[PDB]
């Protein structure tokens, strides 16, 4: 039988993973400080990877890839994409972004240079600053740079795809699981997190309409769809009925390509293929879709939460492919993205 620990209680996904392992009967939960485990559901910060893989006669597995933070912090991702030969700045699917430091390694000057080339040509100059709180959408760099009070200034997508009825923008979230063999698995069920407010290009002040976070939106809500969560069957039907196309063709192909590009770029840096311990990890990818049905990467979440409807299925998927493949027990829900 096998043993595991729980480093971070606040995790909704692995809280569910925890129960289903215990339920199998063949898994024992030791106390967090007990170093005689096979699986570690670790903390989000300063996880001690250095101590893993040194207990004799114990195959150890951890639910995080050391170094995956290169992808999952917004300053890191920008730096990664700009400097990686693989991305090669040949990333047409990532919004023009710049890394700015508060006056309190920086590219504030090149940002202004691009901002001004844009305003000479009368091209749309709306940008977004980020690092529910701490975001400002402005059509002018002065209003962007007095938020200087590490941040990322990113070109705002002024022509997003808007759902009808409602004239409302949305975000897509994909869940991706990478196992110990660095197989890339895409959860077939994504979710669209919707705005319940019609989009308005004249007013960026009222942020909620512009933003799609379930947090901000919470606070019309649930009028078009429940909890502003449209899943893939409905959205695919919408695309067919409204734009005479499918989710697979118009959007999913681009999503799979982006997921592949990101994870294959960092694979030689984080792979545990020839290590003394091994890693798997669940990621949440966030995308936005413009009106020409082009997909843009917004952010990668290293510690993602799931949608209530799907907490059951996804957490079972993790136990099956990511955990039981290392520690066997006594119509896949994943799409395998090959290399």
């Amino acid at each position: 039988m096998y043993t595991f620990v729980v480093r971070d209680e606040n995790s909704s996904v692995y809280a569910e993973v925890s129960r289903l392992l215990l339920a199998t009967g063949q898994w024992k939960r030791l106390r967090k400080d007990n170093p005689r485990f096979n699986l570690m559901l670790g903390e989000r910060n300063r996880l001690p990877f250095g101590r893993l893989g040194h207990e004799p006669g114990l195959v150890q597995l951890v639910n995080y890839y050391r170094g995956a933070d290169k992808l999952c912090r917004k300053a890191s991702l920008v730096k990664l994409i700009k400097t990686s030969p693989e991305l090669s700045e040949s990333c047409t699917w990532f919004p023009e972004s710049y890394v700015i430091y508060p006056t309190n390694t920086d590219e504030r000057e090149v940002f202004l240079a691009a901002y001004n080339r844009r305003r000479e040509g009368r091209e749309g100059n709306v940008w977004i600053a980020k690092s529910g709180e701490g975001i400002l959408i402005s059509s002018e760099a002065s209003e962007l740079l007095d938020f200087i009070d590490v941040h990322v200034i990113q070109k705002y997508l002024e022509k997003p795809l808007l759902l009808e009825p409602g004239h409302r923008k949305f975000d897509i979230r994909s869940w991706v699981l990478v196992d110990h063999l660095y197989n890339i698995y895409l959860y077939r069920e994504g979710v669209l997190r919707t705005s319940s407010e019609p989009y308005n290009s004249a007013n960026f002040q009222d942020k909620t309409c512009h933003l799609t976070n379930h947090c901000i939106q919470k606070e019309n809500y649930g009028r078009y769809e429940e909890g502003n969560e449209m899943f893939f069957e409905e959205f695919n039907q919408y695309l067919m009925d409204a734009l005479n196309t499918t989710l697979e063709n118009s959007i999913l192909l681009q999503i799979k390509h982006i997921i592949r590009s990101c994870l294959m770029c960092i694979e030689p840096a984080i792979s545990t293929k020839h290590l003394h311990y091994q890693s798997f990890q669940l990621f949440g990818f966030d995308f936005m879709v413009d009106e020409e049905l082009k997909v843009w990467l917004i952010e990668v979440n290293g510690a993602p939460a799931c949608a209530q409807k799907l907490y059951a299925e996804l957490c079972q998927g993790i136990v099956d492919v990511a955990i039981s493949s290392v520690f066997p027990l006594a119509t896949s829900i994943f799409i395998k993205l090959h290399h």
Partner: protein
Amino acid sequence: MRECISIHVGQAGVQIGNACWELYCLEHGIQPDGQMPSDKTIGGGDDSFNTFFSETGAGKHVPRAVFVDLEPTVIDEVRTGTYRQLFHPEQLITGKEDAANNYARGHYTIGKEIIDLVLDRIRKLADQCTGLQGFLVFHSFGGGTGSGFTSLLMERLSVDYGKKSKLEFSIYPAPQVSTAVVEPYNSILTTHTTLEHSDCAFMVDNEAIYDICRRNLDIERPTYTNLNRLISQIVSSITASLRFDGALNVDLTEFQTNLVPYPRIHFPLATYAPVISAEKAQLSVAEITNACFEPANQMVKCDPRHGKYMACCLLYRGDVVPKDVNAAIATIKTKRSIQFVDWCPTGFKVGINYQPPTVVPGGDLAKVQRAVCMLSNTTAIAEAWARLDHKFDLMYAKRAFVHWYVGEGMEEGEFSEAREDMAALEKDYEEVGVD
């Protein structure tokens, strides 16, 4: 010719010492009788191998080495072994009861009584030296003698020979081949005391060697003999630049100069390829060089990809030409995750000896045309400190076994004092390799 004196302390140091000097004799064509047919200088000479061997009038070549253990079981084997006639009895020093895996007993209680005798024997060797470069110190981290007496000796050597350089070869404790529970204590205690006296320390983790022995030489339960035979190959590769004509690492001070930009961060990681079983029935320059960046070939299990380099040296033996090395480096520079500190250039110092690696007859390591040892100062080795410090913390929180140390005259304060220094060391590594 500038001489080098080797000091082997405790069971681990002495037994590895045996393997090294056996291998040295094979590499130089010195026989167990001490005669060296190729050496036509007799009872004399300035040659490079003379840095490790002195010569008697009868043409006997004698190791510039001292063996010291607090009990006689291990060194008595040297006294009666195949290469027994190589050493003068002066050289082998034994006490009669050991330090019982107690740092305090080795450093204070027994160290005080045998330190003078040991220094006097070392002095005898130094007196035979025209120019003395320094010492090479072999010991375990976990033994009472290996930890406790070595740290005492290092302090005294700093006094007696202030100018001279000191290099350690240290055995990191591994539970698979260790019978002592208190090793974490002895390791951070000896590391604390010995830190400001060591110019460069090469750590070898028994866990790494054990695994390399099981998986590459297909040995189910390696013995010390197996582990030491392998360790001596790494040690030989490291010291070959002293015993042979070369221009890279010819004097002990080059090691610190080339590998250590910071005094406290003087623990280079070693990696060795190829390791192939004699049984089993080849690797190009680019292949063995690329192997050096594989965790499974490292003397310490850690992940350099998540650390920063400060220096890197490649030590080749056997057939290797410079253009091949440059080529291999270029292809690796592309594929693998190698990063250096901002204040250091991203470069390699390379040494090539034409003599291929030697192997003990009847051993497990098959002879290799080409072999390479990489020495890199990486912040990733700090993983080994954290591992060791954690085990320390677990026991010291309950003061487990602490009474054995206080009872030998140590203060509980020295425990915390040592632990604090280790904590500072960990931070030093973090500041340097993490952004």
